[PDB]
């Protein structure tokens, strides 16, 4: 059956909804970048294997879906941006579009991310006055 899907792959129209029901975090690599995809999901491989059970890992074109990159948090205007979407908290822990994505970069970040802190880097959450009780 089509049950089981590859969990380091490609984020479509089919797949994302089931990493979304894995109930695990997902790393959405928005990559806009057809070329170094290949070396850019190729660092990803060994740094999501390590994490193969525990986080989505999809390479997602930032081309044709890249609205979807600050669908959740980034400007969508920039080289390949990797986001991590919660499945669990909702948030969106995700990288600089301008900085590196590189093997270490990502697995420095998914790792600390994974371990507790890494936050939300913005996301609109007022703090507006409340009353003692």
Excluded at 52 to 65: H, L, P
Aim: negative net charge; proline residues 8%; hydrophobic residues 40%.
């Amino acid at each position: 059956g089509p049950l089981g899907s590859p969990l380091i792959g490609e984020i479509g129209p089919e797949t994302y909804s089931d990493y979304m029901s894995a109930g695990i975090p997902l790393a959405y690599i928005f990559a806009e970048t057809a070329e170094e995809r290949k070396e850019l999901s190729d660092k990803l491989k060994p740094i999501a294997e390590a994490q193969r059970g525990v986080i989505n890992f999809g390479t997602i074109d930032a081309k044709a879906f890249g609205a979807h990159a600050g669908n959740l948090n980034l400007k969508t205007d920039k080289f390949p941006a990797f986001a991590i979407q919660e499945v669990a908290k909702n948030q969106k822990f995700p990288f600089d579009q301008e900085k590196e994505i590189t093997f270490e970069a990502i697995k420095a970040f998914v790792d600390d991310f994974v371990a507790g802190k890494i936050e939300p880097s913005i996301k609109s959450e007022p703090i507006p006055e409340k009353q003692e009780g």
